[PDB]
Amino acid sequence: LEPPPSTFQPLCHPLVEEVSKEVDGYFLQHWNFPNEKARKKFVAAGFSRVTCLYFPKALDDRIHFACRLLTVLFLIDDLLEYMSFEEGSAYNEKLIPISRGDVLPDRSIPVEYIIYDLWESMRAHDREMADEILEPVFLFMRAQTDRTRARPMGLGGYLEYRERDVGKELLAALMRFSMGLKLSPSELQRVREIDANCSKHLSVVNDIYSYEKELYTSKTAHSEGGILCTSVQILAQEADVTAEAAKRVLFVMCREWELRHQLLVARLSAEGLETPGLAAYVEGLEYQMSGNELWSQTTLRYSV
Amino acid sequence: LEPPPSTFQPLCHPLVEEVSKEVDGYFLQHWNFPNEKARKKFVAAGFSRVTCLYFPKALDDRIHFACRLLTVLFLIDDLLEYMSFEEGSAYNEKLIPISRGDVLPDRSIPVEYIIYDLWESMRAHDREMADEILEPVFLFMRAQTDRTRARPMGLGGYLEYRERDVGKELLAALMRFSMGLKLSPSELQRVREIDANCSKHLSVVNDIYSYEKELYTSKTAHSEGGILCTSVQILAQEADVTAEAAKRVLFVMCREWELRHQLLVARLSAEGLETPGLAAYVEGLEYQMSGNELWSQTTLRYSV
Ligand SMILES: C=C(C)[C@H]1CC[N@@H+]2CCC[C@H](C)[C@@]2(C)C1
Ligand SMILES: C=C(C)[C@H]1CC[N@@H+]2CCC[C@H](C)[C@@]2(C)C1
Ligand SMILES: [Mg+2]
Ligand SMILES: [Mg+2]
Ligand SMILES: [Mg+2]
Ligand SMILES: [Mg+2]
Ligand SMILES: [Mg+2]
Ligand SMILES: [Mg+2]
C-alpha cells in the first residue's frame, strides 16, 4: 500500500527510548497478560512510541503520563472485543468513578489500580489540566459500546460517531496537558472546524491500517464487541469495491483533509484570529495526523 | 483536473463525421430550438460524436439510430431542468406510449413525432432488438423525475439510483442493437455484475465533468428540475471537503472500477463462461467507459 504524498513531516518526542522502556516496564510488572506470547505482542505494538509520535512537543516531565494513559486505553480497547455491549459498558463504567478518584480501586485488579494511580499522579502534577481530560475520556469510553455500532451507517454518519470512538477530544486535552498548553474557551470554540477535520484523518488513517486486524476480530471475537465498524468496510460496500481498493481511495481523501487543514489554519490566521496558543495547538494537531500515520504504517499491531 | 492513469483506450466510429452531419441536420430541421444561440450550442455539444465514441463498433447502417435516440434524450434531459418534477413526469409519460407505437403523435409537436418516427424506423430495421430498448428507456425516464432526487442520499444509495438516471440499461440495449449483438437471457445474467460496475464508472465520470454545468443550472433553473443530484456533491458533503476535492477522490474510485471490470472479465473467461458474444459485449462496455471519458473531458457542453 503506497501512501499518496503528504507535505506533513512527522516528529517524535526526543525521550521516546527512555519513556518507552519505563512505561512498557510498568505495564509488564502490573498488567495481567495471558501468556508470554501476549507480553511480547504488547511490547511489539510500541504504545509509547505512538504516544511520542502523537505529542512530540510534550514537556519532558509530562510525556510519560500520556504514554501510560494511551497504553492502558489500548489494552482495554482490545479487551472490549471479547465482550457484549452490555458487558463492555459495565467494564468501562466501573473505571469512571475510579478515574475521577471518587472510588478506591480493588488492588487485586490491575486495571483498577493502574487507572486509579495514573489519574492521581496526573492531578498531582497539574490538577486543572488533568481534570480537563476526564470528560473527553468518558465520552470516548461510552462511544466504544454505543449501540449505533450494531446499526448500518453511511460514511458521514460513521465519521460523526467515530470522532468519539477515536477519542479525538481526549487526544486534544491530553496533548494540551502534555504540553502545558492552556487555551481559553473562546480559543477552543474558534478551532472546532479544524478539530472535526483532523478527527476524520486520524479515524480513516487508523481504519486503513487496522482493517485486517479488525476483519479477523469480527470473525473470531464477540458478536457485538468484535463487530466490524470502519470506513474501509463502509466505502467497500457503498462503492462495491474490495477493501484494498477502498483503502486506496480513502487515502486520497485523507490527503484532501490535509489540504483542508492547511486552508483552515491559513484562514484562522488571515481573519486575525490566530493566537500564540492556537498556533501551537493547530501545529500540535498536524503532528497527531502525521504521527498516527507513521506509527500505523510500521507497527506490528497492524502488520501481524 | 488531471485524470489518473487508465489502461482503457477510446475508439470512435469511422462514420462519425457523416452521421453527425446527418443527425444534427435532422434535429436542426425538426426540433423546436428557441434561437440561433441554442442551435449553435446544440451543434457544439457533439451528441453524435459521443454516440460514436460509445458504440464505435456499431454496424454502419445502424449507428445513426443510436445517434438519433441519444440526441433526443439529451435535448429532453435539458428541457426537464426548467420543469417541476410533476411537469417533467407528465412530459415523459406522454412519450412512452408514443415510443411503443401505441399512440400516434401530434404532428404539430416536434418531440412527439421525432420520438414516434424514430422508434418506428428502429422496429422496421430490427423489431426484436428495438423492442428490447423500450423498457430500459422508460426506466430511465421515470428515474429522471423521481422525488428520490430531492431526498438525502449517501454514496451507495446514489449509485443505485443513478444506474437508472444515467440510463445504463438503455445504453446496453442500444449498444447491442447498434451492433446486431444478440445475447441469450442466460448470457446477460452472467455479466450482470459487470454491468453494475460499469454503470458506476459512466455515472461518476459524467458527474465529475458535468458538475460545473449542473451547479450553474441548480442556481438558475427550476429548483426541482435543476436540483443538484451528483456524486460530487454527495461525497463533498459526506466528507466535508470541497467539490474539487471530491472530484479528485472520485476519479481514483473510477480507476478502481476499471480494475474491477478487468478482474471480473478475466474471471469470466477463466471459468469458461465468456462466449464470443459476451467477449464482444464486455469489450463494448469498455468502449462506453473510455468513450464517455474522452467526450466528457473535451465537449463544450461541459467546458462552456
Ligand atoms: C493514539 C492512537 C494511535 C489512536 C488509535 C486507536 N486507539 C484505540 C484505543 C484508544 C485510543 C484513544 C485510540 C483511539 C488512539
Ligand atoms: C451517453 C452519455 C454520454 C450519457 C451522458 C448523460 N446523458 C444525459 C442525457 C440522457 C442520457 C441517457 C445520458 C445519461 C447519456
Ligand atoms: Mg480497537
Ligand atoms: Mg476501538
Ligand atoms: Mg482501528
Ligand atoms: Mg443532465
Ligand atoms: Mg439527467
Ligand atoms: Mg451530469
- Among the residues of A82-133, which ranges form H helices? 85-100, 110-125, 127-131
Picking from A301, A303, A302, the residue whose alpha carbon sits closest to that of residue A41 is A301
Cα B248 vs. chain centroid, distance in angstroms? Answer: 22
In the residue annotation, B213 being an active-site residue is answered as: no
Please state whether A121 falls in left (phi above 0), alpha (psi between -120 and 50) or beta. alpha
CA dist B72 and B69 (Å) reads 5
Residues 6 or more apart whose CB falls under 8 angstroms from that of B150 comprise B85, B224, B227
The CATH architecture that domain A1-304 belongs to is Orthogonal Bundle (1.10)
| Whether B299 contacts B293, CB under 8 Å | no
CA dist A133 and A172 (Å) reads 9
For A172, the enclosing helix (H) or strand (E) is: helix A168-179
Q: Which residue bears the cell 442556481?
A: B219
Angle between helices B63-79 and B110-125 (to 10 degrees): 150
CA dist B275 and A233 (Å) reads 34
Residues 6 or more apart whose CB falls under 8 angstroms from that of B233 comprise B211, B243, B246
**Long-range own/partner contacts, residues A248-252 (CB < 8 A, 24 or more apart):** A248/A1, A248/B252, A248/B256, A249/B249, A249/B252, A249/B253, A249/B256, A250/A204, A250/A207, A250/A208, A251/A1, A251/A3, A251/A4, A251/A208, A252/A4, A252/B248, A252/B249, A252/B252
CA dist B230 and B236 (Å) reads 10
Q: Does B200 touch chain A (CB under 8 A)?
A: yes
CA dist B14 and B268 (Å) reads 30
Residues 6 or more apart whose CB falls under 8 angstroms from that of B160 comprise none
Residues 6 or more apart whose CB falls under 8 angstroms from that of A181 comprise A175, A277, A280, A281, A284
Picking from A223, A218, A213, the residue whose alpha carbon sits closest to that of residue A84 is A223
Q: Which residue bears the cell 453527425?
A: B20
- Size of chain B, expressed as the number of residues it contains: 304
Q: Does B154 touch chain A (CB under 8 A)?
A: yes
| Whether A183 contacts A175, CB under 8 Å | no
Q: Which three cell numbers stand for residue A77?
A: 480497547
Q: What is the 3-state secondary structure (H, E, C) of chain B?
A: CCCCCCCCCCCCCCCHHHHHHHHHHHHHHHCCCCCHHHHHHHHHHCHHHHHHHHCCCCCCCCHHHHHHHHHHHHHHHHHHHHCCHHHHHHHHHHHHHHHHCCCCCCCCCHHHHHHHHHHHHHHHHCHHHHHHHHHHHHHHHHHHCCHHHHCCCCHHHHHHHHHHHCCHHHHHHHHHHHHCCCCCHHHHHHCHHHHHHHHHHHHHHHHHHHHHHHHHHHHHCCCCCCCCCCHHHHHHHHHCCCHHHHHHHHHHHHHHHHHHHHHHHHHHHHCCCCCHHHHHHHHHHHHHHHHHHHHHHHCHHHHC
Cβ of B54 below 6 Å from ligand 2: yes
- Would you say the C-alpha torsion A26, A29, A33, A38 has a positive or negative sign? positive
**Long-range own/partner contacts, residues A34-42 (CB < 8 A, 24 or more apart):** A41/A300, A42/A75
CA dist B92 and B112 (Å) reads 10
Cα B74 vs. chain centroid, distance in angstroms? Answer: 8
Please give, rounded to a whole number of angstroms, the shortest distance from the CA of A287 to a CA of chain B: 21
CA dist A270 and A282 (Å) reads 14
Buried (b) or exposed (e) across B162-175, using 16+ Cβ within 10 A? bbbbbbbbbbbbbb
Nearest CA to ligand 1 atom 14: A166
Radius of gyration of chain B, Cα coordinates, nearest whole angstrom: 19
B14 by Cβ neighbours in 10 Å (0-12 / 13-18 / 19+) ranks as middle
CA dist B197 and B14 (Å) reads 28
A283 annotated to a ligand binding site: no
Active-site annotation holder among A42, A55, A116, A140: A140
CA dist B201 and B21 (Å) reads 29
Q: Which three cell numbers stand for residue B284?
A: 463494448
A302 annotated to a ligand binding site: yes
Residues 6 or more apart whose CB falls under 8 angstroms from that of B22 comprise B64, B67
Mutation test of the interface with chain B: which of A155, A161, A192, A232, choosing the one with the most B Cβ atoms within 10 A?
Answer: A155
- Size of chain A, expressed as the number of residues it contains: 304
CA dist A242 and A246 (Å) reads 6
| Whether A122 contacts A177, CB under 8 Å | yes
Picking from A240, A260, A227, the residue whose alpha carbon sits closest to that of residue B155 is A240
Q: Which three cell numbers stand for residue A154?
A: 453511511
Contacts of A155 in chain B (CB under 8 A): 154-155, 238-239
CA dist B273 and B292 (Å) reads 27
A220 by Cβ neighbours in 10 Å (0-12 / 13-18 / 19+) ranks as exposed
A210 annotated to a ligand binding site: yes
CA dist B190 and A240 (Å) reads 17
Picking from B288, B271, B77, B36, the residue whose alpha carbon sits closest to that of residue B169 is B288
In the residue annotation, B55 being an active-site residue is answered as: no
Q: Which residue bears the cell 463492555?
A: A88
CA dist A271 and A164 (Å) reads 29
What DSSP line would sit under A16-71, residue for residue?
HHHHHHHHHHHHHHHS--SSHHHHHHHHHH-HHHHHHHH-TT--TTTHHHHHHHHH
- Give me the resolution in angstroms, 1 decimal: 2.0
Please give, rounded to a whole number of angstroms, the shortest distance from the CA of A89 to a CA of chain B: 29
Instruction: Please give the distance, rounded to the nearest whole angstrom, from the Cα atom of residue B165 to the centre of ligand 7.
Output: 6
| Whether B289 contacts B261, CB under 8 Å | yes
- How many other CB atoms are there within 10 angstroms of residue A146's CB atom? 15
Angle between helices A155-165 and A192-220 (to 10 degrees): 90
Picking from A208, A197, A159, A172, the residue whose alpha carbon sits closest to that of residue A288 is A172
Residues 6 or more apart whose CB falls under 8 angstroms from that of A101 comprise A116, A119, A120, A123
Cβ of B167 below 6 Å from ligand 2: yes
CA dist A158 and A170 (Å) reads 19
Number of alpha helices (DSSP H) and beta strands (DSSP E) in chain A:
16, 0
Q: Which three cell numbers stand for residue B190?
A: 452472467
Identify the three-state secondary structure at position A102.
Answer: coil
Q: Which three cell numbers stand for residue A38?
A: 501476549
Buried (b) or exposed (e) across A88-98, using 16+ Cβ within 10 A? bbebbebbbeb
CA dist A46 and A299 (Å) reads 7
Nearest CA to ligand 2 atom 9: B74
Residues 6 or more apart whose CB falls under 8 angstroms from that of A170 comprise A133, A136, A137, A139, A140
> What are the domain boundaries of chain B?
1-304
CA dist A129 and A237 (Å) reads 42
